[PDB]
Symmetry: none
């Protein structure tokens, strides 16, 4: 059949600001940090950590992710 | 059949600000941080952590995520 | 059949601000932080943590998420 | 058959502010934080934590989430 | 048959503010925080925690969430 | 048959403020916080915690949520 | 100001037949004819002769039709 | 100001037949004819003769039709 | 200002037949003819003779039609 | 300012037949003829004779049609 | 300013037949003829005779059609 | 300023037949003929006679058509 | 003079258990906690909080505690 | 004069257990905690918090605690 | 004069356990913690926090604690 | 004069366990922690935090603690 | 005069365990930690933090601690 | 005069264990740490942090600590 | 077992004169004389002749005084 | 077992005169004389002749005084 | 076992005169004389003749005084 | 086992005169003389003649005094 | 085992006169003489004649005094 | 084992006069003479004649005094 599973984004005579992480002043601070830190014996199969207009597209067709 | 499972976003003579994480002043603070910290023997299969206009599209067709 | 399970967003001569996490002053504070901290032997299969105009689209077609 | 299970949002000559988490002053405070903290032997299958104009669309077609 | 289970939102010459979590002053306070804290041996299958104009759409078609 | 189980919201030459959690002054206080705290051996199957113009739409068609 | 002088026609799960001139049998007949025939020294300035779901929109903004 | 003088026609899961001039049998007949015939010294300035789902839009912005 | 004087026509999962002049049998007949015939010294400035789903858009911006 | 005077036509999972002049049988007949015939000393300045899904767009920006 | 005076036509998973003049049988007949015939001393300045999905776009920017 | 006066036509997973003049049988007939015949002392300045999916674009930028 | 303001405790061939805070089982409980929590503009001059065989001896001789 | 303001504790052939804070099992609990938490503009001059066989002896001789 | 303001503790053929904070099992708990947390503009002059057989002896002789 | 403000502790053929902070099992817990955390503009002049058989002896003779 | 402000500790044929901080098992825990964390504009003049058999003796004779 | 402000500790045929910080197992933990962390514009004049049988003796004779 | 056969004499802020043989005037006299004089073949085994605050302690543990 | 057969004499802020043989005047006198004089064939085994605060302690542990 | 057969004498801020044989005037007198004079064939085994604060300690451990 | 058969004498801030034989005037007198005079065939085994603060300690460990 | 058979004498800030034989005036007198005079065939084995703060310690370890 | 049979004498900030035989005036007198005079066939084995702060220590380890 006909399948459209996509990100469709069209702009016409437009103005768009987006996905901006803006620090003006920082001191002894941890600001906007994407992190994973301290894992032990963990089993993660589809965990996309995403931020600030970044993109993660996964198209599995008849595929097999096996973590045995 | 006909399948449309997509993100459709069209702009016409428009103005749009979105997904902005903006710090002006920070001191001894932890501000807007996406994090996962301390996991032990965890089993996570589809956990998208997402923020600030970022995108995560997963299209599994006849696929198999096996965590055995 | 015909299936439309999508995010349809159209703009016409419009102005839109949205999904903005804005800090002006921070001191010894933890402000707007998306986090997961301390898990032990946890089983999570579809838990999208989402914030600030970010997007997470999952389209499973005839697929199988198996956590055995 | 014909199935429309979507997010339809159209704008015509309009002005819209929404999903804004705005801090002006913070001191020794924890403000607007999406978090999951301390889980032990937990079984969560569809728990979307969502905030500030973020979106989480799940379209399972003839699919199977098995946590055995 | 014809099925329309959607979020339909149209704007015509309108002005709309909504889903805004706005702090002006905070001190030694915990303000607007979406959180899950301390779970032990919990079984949660469809618990969407949602806030501030965020959206969570789940469309299961002939699908099976099995937590055995 | 014809089924319309949707959220239909149309605006025509209108002005609407809604779903706003607004703090002006806070001190040693816990204000507007959506939380779940301390669960032990709990079984929750459809418990949407929702607040401030956020939305949670669940469309199960011929589906099966099994917590055995 | 805000001015909406338009033809707004929306259809939702509907069936509509309209503006249909259907002849099955005709003999030596004049059937459903829009015509103007024999004018002499006539002065017509806005005369829309319309039929069968046809449309005629006149939008004059600060304009001048002068027949001197 | 904001001006919407337009033809807005949206279709959702609908079926519509319109503006159809269908002849099945004709003999020595004049059927569904749009015509203007025999004019002498006529002065016509905005006369839309429209039929069968046809459209005629006149948008005059600060303009001048002068027939002197 | 913002001006929308347009023909807006959107189709979603729809079926539409329109503007159709269909002859099945004709003999010694004049069927569905758009015509202007015999004019003498005529002055016509904006006369759209339109039919069968045809379209005529006049957008005059600060213009001058002078027939002197 | 922002000006949208256009023909906007979008199709989504739709089926549309329109503007079709179909003759099956003709004998000694004049069927669906667009014509202008016999003019004498005529002055026509904007007369669109349109038919069968054809289109005619006039966009005059600060222009001058002078018939002196 | 921003000016959009255009013919915008987008197709998505659609099927469209239009502007079709189809003769099956003709004898001693004049079928679907666009014609202008016998003019004498005529003054025509913008007269688009259009048919069958054909297109005619006039975009005059600060121009001058002078018939003196 | 920004000016978009164009013919925008995009196709996505679509099927479209249009502008087709198809004769199957003709005898002693004049079928689908675009013609201009017998003009005497005529003054025509912008007269597009268009048919069958053909296109005619006039883009006059600060130009002058002078018929003196 | 002779002043004896003391804690005199003598043991002879004795057995004494005292001041024991003993928890065997605790769950989601706050057990035996000495605390002061949330004071604002408070003036406390001699407030000994004491527990579990702890001791607080204050001997002021000709001294002056001034809280001005 | 003779002043004895002391803690006199003598043991002779004795057995004494005292001041013991003993936890055997704790879960999601706050057990035996000496704490002061959240003070604002407080004035405390002699407030000994004491617990579990701890000792606090204050001997001020002709001294002056001045909090001006 | 003769002044004895002391801690006198003598042991003769004795056995003494005291001031013991003993945890056997802890999970997601805060057990026996001496703490001061969040003070703002506080004035504390003699506040000994003491626990578990610890000792705090203050001997001010003709001294002056001035907090001006 | 004769002044004895001391800690006198003598042992004769004795056995003494005291001031022991003993953890056997800890998980995601904060156990026995002496801490001061988050102070702002605080004025503390004699605040000994003491624990687990530790000692703090202050002997001020004719001295002056001035916090001006 | 004669002044004895001392720590006198004598042992005769004795056995003494004291001031022991003993961890057997720790995981994702903060156990027995002496700390001061986050101070801002604080004024502390005699604050001995003491633990686990440690000692802090201060003997000021005719001295002057001036914090001006 | 005669002044004895000292730490007098004598042992006779005795056995003494004390001031021992003993970790057997640690994982992702912070155990027994003496620390000072994040100070800003702080004024500390006599703050001995002491632990595990360590000693801090201060003997100021006719001295002057001036922090001006 | 525990055996206390001792002379226990403690003094607290007391004044005691005792065991005093004071002669002021003596002439040809025998005053306060402890004596044994003229024994012949005598057998004395435990005969304490004691006077004036003198002390005689006999502690025989499993011993044997044999006068054979 | 525990055995305490001792002379325990403690003094605290006390004044004690004892065991004093004071002669002021003596003439031809025998004053306060301890003596044994004229023994013949005597058998004395434990005869303490004690006076004036003198002391005689006999501690025989498993011993044997044999006068055979 | 534990055995304490000793002379324990402790002094604290005390004044003690004892065991003093003071003669002021003597003439032809025998004053305060300890003597044994004229023994014949005597058998004395433990005879302590003690006076004036003098001391005699006999500690026989598993010993044998044999006068055979 | 533990054995303490000793002379324990401790002085703290005390004044003690003892064991003093003071003659002021003597004439033809025998004053304070310790003597043994005229023995014949005597058998003395442990006879301590002690005076004036003098000391005699006999510690026989598994020893044998044999007078055969 | 542990054996303490000793003369323990400690002085702290004390004043002590003792064991003093002081003659001021003597004439034809025998004053404070320790003597043994006229023995015949005597058998003395442990006879300490001690005076005036003198000391005599006999420590016999597994020894043998044999007078055969 | 551990054996302490010693003369332990420690002085701390003390003043001590002792063991002093002081004659001021003597005439035809015998004052403070230690003597043994006229022995015949005597058997003395351990006879310490000690005076005036003199010392005599006998430490016999596994030794043998044989007077055969």
């Amino acid at each position: 059949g006909q399948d459209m599973q996509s990100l469709f984004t069209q702009y016409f005579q437009s103005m768009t600001e987006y996905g901006k992480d803006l620090v003006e002043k920082a001191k002894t601070s941890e600001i906007q940090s994407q992190a994973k830190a301290y894992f032990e014996k963990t089993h993660e199969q589809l965990t996309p950590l995403v931020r600030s207009a970044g993109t993660s597209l996964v198209n599995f067709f008849s595929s097999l992710m096996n973590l045995e």
